[PDB]
A paper describes a structure:
Crystallographic and biochemical studies show that MBLAC1 has an overall MBL fold and di-zinc ion containing active site related to that of CPSF73, but which has distinctive structural features involving active site flanking loops and the absence of the β-CASP domain, which is only present in CPSF73. The combined biochemical, cellular, and genetic analyses presented here provide clear evidence that MBLAC1 is an endoribonuclease selective for 3' end processing of RD histone pre-mRNA during S-phase of the cell cycle. Studies with recombinant MBLAC1 purified from human or E. coli cells, define MBLAC1 as an endoribonuclease, with selectivity for cleavage at the biologically authentic CA dinucleotides (positions 27 and 29 using our nomenclature).
To investigate its function, we solved a crystal structure of MBLAC1 (1.8 Å resolution, space group P1). MBLAC1 has four of the five characteristic MBL-metal-binding motifs, His116, His118 Asp120 and His121 (motif II), His196 (motif III), Asp221 (motif IV) and His263 (motif V) (using BBL numbering) with two waters completing metal coordination. In the structure of recombinant MBLAC1 produced in E. coli, the active site was refined with two iron ions present. However, MBLAC1 produced in HEK293 cells preferentially binds zinc ions. Four MBLAC1 molecules (chains A-D) are present in the crystallographic asymmetric unit; analysis of interactions at the crystallographically observed monomer interfaces identified interactions between chains A-B and C-D possibly reflecting dimeric MBLAC1 in solution. The metal containing active site is adjacent to the dimer interface, rationalizing reduced dimerization as manifested by metal ligand substitution or metal removal. However, although there is low overall sequence similarity (27%), the overall MBLAC1 fold is structurally similar to the human endoribonuclease β-lactamase-like-protein 2 (LACTB2), RMSD 2.23 Å over 153 Cα atoms, an endoribonuclease responsible for mitochondrial mRNA maturation. Comparison of the MBLAC1 and LACTB2 active sites reveals very similar di-metal ion binding modes and proximate active site residues. Two other regions in the MBLAC1 structure (aa 51–66 and the C-terminal region, aa 239–266) are disordered, implying flexibility and possible involvement in substrate recognition.
Numbering used by the authors:
A (entry chain D): 5 to 54, 70 to 242
B (entry chain C): 5 to 53, 70 to 241
Write the structure that this text describes.
């Protein structure tokens, strides 16, 4: 069973060593007539408490942003960050779950951050460092903090961020692996590779107590 | 065969009704030791002299094809200004695929329509559906088309084809071509080598000039 996670906005999930704050909740709204959709992706902040393998671990010692929204969301992102006491210049790592325009629209706000966009990792300045991310080999960012390969939606190189040890248990920031709570009958049409995405969805639901989907509010996973 | 395209920088290909200017030439440089690579994507400006209608309207002003990584912001702004273009003047941004060194500065152009891979949205994030496919290009204008060129980034990569320039047909190919002479290097970087080879052949049939993702433009002879 799953229930949308209600509570004070922005949704803050305290934890140790990492807290998670959903800065902007995603949406995807159809229109009264025609087939257009107004949408934007969720943006999540992972906050540490108060070759490529080592660089990732170092870049994760500061604020980590998971997705950035579309370009139109720039002022709202800046405001949300400020609300958490974080200047754009303070962000040390940006993770882009996949390369769609409503998820990676504001990378340029963070020229001082390391960037992990899908499976490509670079230091600030565009020095790309190879690594071995795969479905059987997650990337360790820190204690109880990992990047998973969760292919399917955007293609074979989508990633998710898994945050263990919060007050609500394990939070998975899943990109569009999940569209929203109750997307059981809608996600397949949006998917590049439904078979892969199904494997990824099942994998996430084994570990997650909370899922932050790409286009809706976070939800709890019950057992 | 192919040959590097020589001339004055920035590389300007005049034409009618569209001119093409390579604002920033991409590169991907290995290091003296270890396996790291410093890279950035080519950025091209196409200048005029439901979704189908929106696309034609958005292509009536300056069109940017890719944007470079986030570290390239000031260089991109400078190059645009050198062409008399303010960022606010750009009416359409085309992202060939979603890698960080191609779509790193989308946020500079909030007033532009965006076509990143197969997703088209008006400014503000209103996404409009369309029928782009390998057998169904999107028409932007006279002799200006977006092609579906899958392979490198995945199944939804796109390329911009500009007919009628002084040098003939210019294809802005994203990473469909890494660089002139990439014959034995592109495969390792490809998410679907079968699709990418299909796309490379398609492009080479029509192109007189290719702007690849990580090198200078080259002529096709
Ligand atoms: Fe999305
Ligand atoms: Fe998506
Ligand atoms: Fe590239
Ligand atoms: Fe690429």
């Amino acid at each position: 069973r799953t229930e949308p996670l209600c509570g004070a906005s922005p949704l803050l999930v305290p934890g140790d060593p990492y807290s998670v704050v959903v800065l902007l909740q995603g949406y995807a709204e159809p229109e009264g007539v025609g087939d257009a959709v107004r949408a934007d992706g969720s943006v999540t902040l992972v906050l540490p408490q108060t070759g490529a393998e080592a660089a990732l671990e170092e870049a994760a010692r500061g604020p980590i942003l998971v997705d950035t929204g579309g370009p139109w969301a720039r002022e709202a992102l800046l405001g949300a960050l400020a609300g958490q006491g974080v200047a754009p210049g303070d962000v040390t790592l940006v993770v882009g779950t996949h390369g769609h325009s409503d998820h990676i629209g504001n990378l340029g706000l963070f020229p001082g951050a390391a960037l992990l966009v899908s499976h490509d990792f670079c230091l600030p300045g565009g020095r790309y460092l190879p690594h071995g991310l795969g479905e059987g080999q997650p990337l360790r960012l820190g204690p109880g903090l990992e990047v998973w390969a969760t292919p399917g939606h955007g293609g074979q190189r989508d990633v998710s961020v898994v945050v263990a040890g919060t007050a609500l248990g394990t939070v998975v920031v899943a990109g569009d692996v999940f569209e929203r709570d109750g997307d059981e009958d809608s996600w397949q049409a949006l998917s590049e590779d439904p078979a892969a995405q199904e494997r990824s969805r099942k994998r996430v639901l084994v570990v997650a107590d909370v899922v932050v989907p790409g286009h809706g509010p976070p939800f709890r996973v019950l057992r």
